[PDB]
Design a binder for these strands. Structure first.
Ligand SMILES: *[C@@H]1O[C@H](CO)[C@@H](O[C@@H]2O[C@H](CO)[C@@H](O)[C@H](O)[C@H]2NC(C)=O)[C@H](O)[C@H]1NC(C)=O
Ligand SMILES: *[C@@H]1O[C@H](CO)[C@@H](O[C@@H]2O[C@H](CO)[C@@H](O)[C@H](O)[C@H]2NC(C)=O)[C@H](O)[C@H]1NC(C)=O
Ligand SMILES: *[C@@H]1O[C@H](CO)[C@@H](O[C@@H]2O[C@H](CO)[C@@H](O)[C@H](O)[C@@H]2O)[C@H](O)[C@H]1NC(C)=O
Ligand SMILES: Nc1ncnc2c1ncn2[C@@H]1O[C@H](CO)[C@H]2OP(=O)(O)O[C@H]21
Ligand SMILES: Nc1ncnc2c1ncn2[C@@H]1O[C@H](CO)[C@H]2OP(=O)(O)O[C@H]21
Ligand SMILES: *[C@@H]1O[C@H](CO)[C@@H](O)[C@H](O)[C@H]1NC(C)=O
Ligand SMILES: *[C@@H]1O[C@H](CO)[C@@H](O)[C@H](O)[C@H]1NC(C)=O
Ligand SMILES: *[C@@H]1O[C@H](CO)[C@@H](O)[C@H](O)[C@H]1NC(C)=O
Ligand SMILES: *[C@@H]1O[C@H](CO)[C@@H](O)[C@H](O)[C@H]1NC(C)=O
Ligand SMILES: *[C@@H]1O[C@H](CO)[C@@H](O)[C@H](O)[C@H]1NC(C)=O
Ligand SMILES: *[C@@H]1O[C@H](CO)[C@@H](O)[C@H](O)[C@H]1NC(C)=O
Ligand SMILES: *[C@@H]1O[C@H](CO)[C@@H](O)[C@H](O)[C@H]1NC(C)=O
Ligand SMILES: *[C@@H]1O[C@H](CO)[C@@H](O)[C@H](O)[C@H]1NC(C)=O
Ligand SMILES: *[C@@H]1O[C@H](CO)[C@@H](O)[C@H](O)[C@H]1NC(C)=O
Lengths: 772, 772
RNA sequence: UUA
RNA sequence: UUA
């Protein structure tokens, strides 16, 4: 169909709307800019390659470029690969960019540059030089950037990329940049706010530096500033997972009371990890628009009990006061000031790491009439006691987070403790009201524990110690609960009445409850599903289930069952017929995951035993060594079959003769060495075929008829063992001239032989010598 | 060194003392008996091959054979591989064995034989025919076995290898076998004890059959019997993990009261899973020598409270009454009869699965004066309450087992519930008194819990719910404890005083206590080791440790640290020097396991950071992509280095220049494609080198000097990519003629090329054309 | 590949 | 391979 094969090792996209020709060569092991890049190219990405230099030749023809992304072709030693250390810094020749009249964005982050590159065109709006070795900014080097709006200069001097001196910025270096909106100088070992800065700034990032003092006029002319981040100047260093040097005598960052007086437009103020002991009300006198305030990782425990400054923040949406506890103190109570009640617009309040023994209803009374409050995060507080009934006065909330506490009768895993959570690289909430009790010490539960919480839509009990024989009495008040996460407990399914009181339960997660399934002679009633009349989804992954008192699971409602990481190999021991119908009476089941069940083979009766509307079956990662393909005829509604990461060596003689319904066949990471002669013949239903990471040498036309290939949304063939002899003439031609989407066609569809052509892409292969 | 290359694909051993020539061809993918088996061969093993027949040709020359092991060359469909099903049963021609005048043992198990093979020589003492299809035994077929002493006929008719009829044994079929000592007819669907049996029997195995009734004279003449097993006739089938058919009418196996009167010599009586409700004293009237009695999986709950039969068993060493509970009953107490106190010789008492709520001191009073009691096993009883101080009256015991209970304030994983625990295939006790509390519901511990248990040498708390901040007050009474297993709990290392009260602790296991290490901003005091002055071995595997409040671990005593499955990659993040000395002050440390820590590289300073006496270092399974071999020079006492399952592509230019001490280098499962020119030159200290499962093409003599190779105890080279051209002449010759042990030389040391020689063993490779 |  |  295609007249000219695409040989270029980069993804090319067209967006004729926004008038872009997008060439993405991210991570293609390039040592040169590839030849033959389209002349109409507008966005060119060469991130993560080993191109040692740029010159006038680099972009000679590419005069329509609006964006070059040339990040991480020489990333600093400590940040980059140790197995492929860049030997010498990126070399930028004179006149390399001055021809690109239309260039609006240039990313040269992570190239070990020593200086701000010169001869940039006046069209440039965005320049990024993060993770280089530029630690002295001179006015003279910045004249070329007259029209610049966004300037990223961070991560040029810090523990992962040191310069061993203080950062230098000439007086007024940036003042003549009259269009500058965003300046980032984070993670740079800066000692003072550089002045004077242009009044056109909207965003100023000065975090993770060595600034001990703010002068009262440092921010004087910045009447357009919207975002200010001064975090990590005078850090709180307790349990820091990076090298952390506080200011002497554990002094706070010193901020005059009138330092923010000009910032009428400020929306975000971040003062994380500044060792603050006091938040003076006077700070917020002329900021009436402040929406987000981060005061996490300070020493504001006392202040939280007083907090007069809150009276000046009626427009605040987000407040973060996490990790303000006094070292070596375990308070009895949380003392929230009445001033919290003036936070009229507050949607989100986080106070992790206050560290207190007992949470009581009254302590939260300042929050009672906050009409817009949506999230209350009291995680990581080592709370031992809480009457959960107190949250009956918080029905309007979307999330109550008591995660990581010590109670007994979505932010990243590292968040409050990472160095730079905004650093650039080279869930049941949607069901309604959520009470997150994950990672507590709840060993026993009873109905009264949930009195007055009938409004709850999701309860998270993951990672507790719950070991009891649930009999259906434990959750009686939770009449509206749609989602229970009971993973990482110690469920004992002695009673088939477990969970039946949750009459509106749609999703049950009982994954990683393997404990009692690990000892012989214990009763397990897997038939507990019968009572849950609206259950849609059941997850029982990683339970190590190798035995069951009940022979069948039953549901009229269940659509999805995850049964990964169990021992169906033992339940279906060849010769034992008793569990061959375990899932058959799940009448509405469409999706079954029985990956990771050590099924090295499937006994006969398994497919017959499957429920009638099964659509999506995974048998991945089972060490399957054999498969009777014909048995797929019992799965009359099968559409998706995942057999990835097994040991299959052969495909069926005629797939169409095995299933009338099959659309998506995943066979990646198997041991397949050849395709059968008529493999895909008349498989009119097929739409997706993954044959990647096998050991295929040859594919002949008979296997791959064009009336089937041409309905495929995608065909994966990469990481095989293709033999590029004259025998392969058809496959080589076809691959070169097909419209069919085949990912990695240029990069990992490769000849392994013979000799001459070893390591060569088949897309690039010239076989004229087969045709003389 | 060797004059004639060993080409036979079997391991050949000499024991010139016992005059044996032992040829072991186990699992060598043979379809033929190999030619050239030594003529002096005495023991020939051909287990697990696909040899389709035996004939007079098979053993023509092998006239000194005393033992043929020809098991599992055609194992029944349900028992064998589904990816390589034996197509047709093993064919044994007339006259195949009649020439083997000296043959004493013939194993033909698992070959799908239909009949007992005839023409066996009169020398035969042992014949094994398990897992065949022989389910009718006729006197006529057994005349040839005049001299036979051991006959295994089991697993010829059961659920995994069905015959679909009752087993048939002719009247008196075995009587004329006047030397028969051991008869096994287990797992055979036998319906009556065959009679009459020879009086020379010492062992009779009739378990897992369909025998409903013992006739009073079935065992009349068996005055030499030592072992009788009638288990699994009328099985107790609750929660059975195999298909289990009880006798109708809930009947027990019916044994007349005088059935054992003749068995004066009986030592072992096994009546497991016979649905017994009563144990009549009259059974044991003329058995005064009985040492082992298994009454597990019956219905003897009531009987345990009475048990008059015990008065007749003063010589009994082992009593097992496990799994006798009445279905649907949860007793308050254990009612042990006073008759237990007459068990004068008892060393081992097991009563798992009695199922009761509360254990109290008095309930065990019948055991108080059993002077030789060594093991009391009360596991899997769902006990909720036990004052552990009761065991102060059991100081003399070696093991108190309360594993798998419900307490709160070595037998195989499947044992009582497996079909045939004696079926043939094709720990802290040694420290002294052990209290095993593993797999209970203990969420909190205090010193008083251990009052009066000062004698304990090992405590097992594995798999409890212990979540507390141990401050060193919790185990105060346990002044003699040498071994604490605290794995699979939720250790919170807030206090560096944790465990310090255990002044004699030699082994601490705190593995799989990952819970609190998974959440940011939690204090962990890894320096807690300092206070344990005699600690030899610390295991803290799978703790997911990625952060630590202390920078160094300290011990004067510690020899072995297991730190597998943690996040040293995070602790040693490039640029962070703070934890590079974490193990340095473990001054006597010899063994460090830091496998599975995602160390894709080692920062410089890690080797310098190692303690000075390190002998055995594992860096396995880290995804290591690079390794500065020269830095091994800091490890002046290094003997074993395990770098298995990594991504290394190169070896050092000269290993001797890296380490003077290194004896054992494990490099298996890496990506190594060639060896350096002088790799092993002058590395005379080397004794073990595993280079298996790499991608090596060539090895030249310069890399592999013979003055080093020859003193290797072992050299592993299998599963590489060897190219068998004239360039490989040296390696091929050396491999063919070396004394040095190289495993799998016959099976997986293979040429991948070129063309001709692909898939061929290098041992078998003829390279004469390289020498014309 | 008799569990 | 800026976290
Ligand atoms: C940030 O700048 C500081 C101080 O300006 C640097 O600290 C100096 O480092 C040199 C070389 O290591 C030492 O000889 C001096 O003792 C240090 N001076 C002071 C006053 O501390 C520091 O290296 C810089 N940080 C980074 C990460 O580059
Ligand atoms: C070689 O074959 C002989 C004959 O089967 C084996 O000797 C037997 O070993 C058992 C072990 O329990 C002894 O108790 C018996 O007395 C021996 N039987 C006979 C008939 O002599 C010998 O062990 C075999 N050796 C090897 C390594 O396979
Ligand atoms: C043990 O012997 C049984 C008979 O005593 C076998 O049961 C028979 O099975 C056939 C059909 O397969 C029935 O139609 C017939 O009524 C009879 O009861 C049983 O299969 C056998 N056990 C094994 C494991 O082979
Ligand atoms: N707390 C408990 N947890 C699990 N099983 C229990 C408990 N109490 C009694 N059992 C009984 O133990 C047996 C094995 O699980 C099982 O048989 P059952 O009589 O049906 O009740 C049960
Ligand atoms: N049970 C507990 N487990 C862990 N930390 C606790 C506990 N109770 C109070 N803390 C305090 O939480 C902090 C982070 O772990 C830690 O620093 P600290 O102030 O010394 O005391 C502690
Ligand atoms: C192309 O470049 C322009 C300007 O830098 C930018 O706004 C646009 O997002 C880019 N698109 C892509 C997909 O790179
Ligand atoms: C809360 O703390 C503030 C300031 O530390 C203090 O003045 C106030 O009295 C405290 N209130 C309670 C209820 O402890
Ligand atoms: C919890 O608070 C509620 C008030 O909503 C009350 O009914 C109940 O008694 C309290 N429970 C406990 C254990 O204090
Ligand atoms: C429950 O909390 C756990 C751990 O804190 C988290 O992994 C999980 O995604 C949460 N469950 C849901 C359904 O959001
Ligand atoms: C589950 O199985 C058992 C029999 O094994 C039965 O008593 C029980 O009622 C079943 N439960 C349901 C909910 O169907
Ligand atoms: C099939 O199920 C898997 C879950 O294993 C899911 O990720 C995938 O999208 C499903 N595909 C279809 C077509 O439903
Ligand atoms: C498979 O092919 C044969 C012959 O073409 C035909 O009899 C049989 O019905 C086919 N089965 C299916 C499911 O198409
Ligand atoms: C403790 O018990 C556990 C769980 O049964 C077992 O894995 C482990 O071997 C025991 N530990 C010791 C030291 O015996
Ligand atoms: C462990 O380290 C901490 C400081 O990080 C210190 O307070 C404590 O005393 C140390 N304990 C021991 C036994 O070394």
């Amino acid at each position: 169909a295609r007249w000219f094969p695409k040989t270029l090792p980069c993804d090319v996209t067209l967006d004729v709307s926004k008038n872009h020709v997008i060439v993405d060569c991210t991570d293609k092991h390039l040592t040169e800019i590839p030849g033959g890049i389209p002349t109409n190219t507008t966005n060119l990405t060469l991130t993560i390659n080993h191109i040692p230099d740029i010159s006038p030749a680099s972009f000679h023809r590419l005069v329509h470029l609006v964006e070059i992304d040339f990040r991480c072709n020489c990333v600093p030693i400590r940040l980059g690969s140790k197995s492929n250390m860049c030997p010498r810094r990126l070399q930028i020749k004179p006149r390399s960019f001055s021809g690109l009249t239309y260039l609006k964005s240039l990313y040269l982050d992570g190239n070990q540059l020593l200086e701000i590159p010169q001869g940039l065109p006046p069209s440039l709006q965005l320049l990024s030089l993060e993770a280089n070795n530029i630690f002295s900014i001179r006015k003279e080097q910045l004249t070329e950037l007259a029209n610049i709006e966004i300037l990223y200069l961070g991560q040029n001097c810090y523990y992962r990329n040191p310069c061993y001196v203080s950062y230098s910025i000439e007086k007024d270096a940036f003042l003549n940049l009259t269009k500058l909106k965003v300046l980032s100088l984070k993670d740079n070992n800066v000692t003072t706010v550089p002045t004077v800065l242009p009044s056109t700034l909207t965003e100023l990032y000065l975090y993770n530096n060595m600034i001990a003092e703010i002068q009262e006029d440092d921010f004087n002319n910045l009447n357009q500033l919207q975002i200010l981040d001064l975090s990590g100047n005078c850090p709180r260093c307790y349990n820091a997972p990076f090298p952390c040097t506080p200011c002497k005598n554990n002094s706070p960052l010193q901020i005059p009371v009138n330092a923010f007086d000009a910032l009428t437009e400020l929306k975000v103020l971040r003062l994380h990890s500044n060792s603050l002991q006091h938040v003076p009300p006077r700070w917020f006198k002329n900021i009436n628009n402040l929406q987000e305030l981060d005061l996490s990782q300070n020493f504001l425990a006392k202040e939280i009990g007083d907090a007069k400054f809150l009276h000046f923040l009626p427009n605040l949406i987000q407040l973060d006061l996490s990790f303000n506890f006094e070292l070596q103190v375990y308070r009895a109570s949380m003392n929230l000031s009445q001033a919290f009640s003036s936070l009229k617009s507050l949607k989100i309040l986080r106070i992790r790491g206050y560290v207190f023994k007992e949470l009581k209803s009254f302590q939260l009374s300042p929050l009672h009439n906050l009409q817009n409050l949506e999230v209350l995060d009291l995680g990581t507080n080592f709370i031992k006691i809480a009457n959960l009934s107190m949250f009956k006065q918080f029905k309007r909330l979307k999330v109550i987070d008591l995660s990581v506490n010590k109670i007994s009768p979505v932010l990243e895993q590292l968040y409050y403790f990472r160095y730079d959570k905004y650093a650039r690289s080279c869930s049941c909430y949607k069901y309604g009201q959520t009470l997150d009790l994950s990672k507590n010490s709840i060993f026993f539960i009873k109905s009264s524990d949930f009195q007055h919480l009938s409004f709850l839509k999701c309860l998270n009990l993951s990672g507790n110690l719950i070991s009891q024989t649930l009999n259906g009495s434990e959750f009686q008040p939770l009449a509206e609960l749609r989602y229970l996460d009971f993973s990482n407990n110690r469920l004992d399914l002695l009673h088939s009445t477990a969970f039946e009181e949750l009459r509106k339960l749609e999703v049950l997660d009982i994954s990683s409850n393997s404990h009692y399934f690990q000892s012989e002679g214990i009763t397990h009633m897997l038939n507990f599903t019968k009572n849950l009349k609206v259950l849609q989804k059941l997850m029982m992954n990683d339970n190590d289930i190798s035995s069951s008192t009940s022979r069948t699971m039953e549901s009229e409602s269940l659509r999805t069952l995850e049964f990964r990481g169990n021992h169906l190999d033992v339940l279906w021991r060849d010769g034992d017929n008793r569990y061959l119908q375990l899932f058959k009476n799940l009448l509405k089941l469409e999706e079954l995951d029985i990956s990771k069940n050590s099924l090295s083979f499937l006994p006969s009766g398994v497919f017959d035993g499957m429920p009638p509307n099964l659509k999506n079956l995974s048998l991945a990662k089972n060490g399957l060594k054999s498969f009777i393909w014909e048995k797929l005829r019992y799965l009359k509604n099968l559409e998706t079959l995942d057999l990835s990461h097994n040991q299959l060596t052969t495909v069926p003689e005629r797939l169409s003769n095995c299933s009338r319904s099959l659309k998506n066949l995943i066979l990646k990471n198997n041991q397949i060495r050849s395709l059968t002669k008529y493999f895909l013949q008349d498989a009119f239903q097929l739409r997706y075929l993954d044959l990647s990471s096998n050991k295929i040498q040859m594919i002949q036309k008979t296997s791959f008829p064009e009336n089937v290939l041409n309905n495929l949304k995608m065909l994966l063939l990469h990481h095989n063992r293709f033999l590029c002899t004259c025998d392969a003439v058809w496959f080589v031609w076809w691959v070169q001239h097909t419209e069919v989407t085949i990912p990695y066609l240029a990069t990992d569809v490769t000849c392994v032989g013979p000799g001459a052509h070893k390591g060569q892409s088949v897309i690039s292969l010239d076989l004229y010598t087969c045709e003389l």
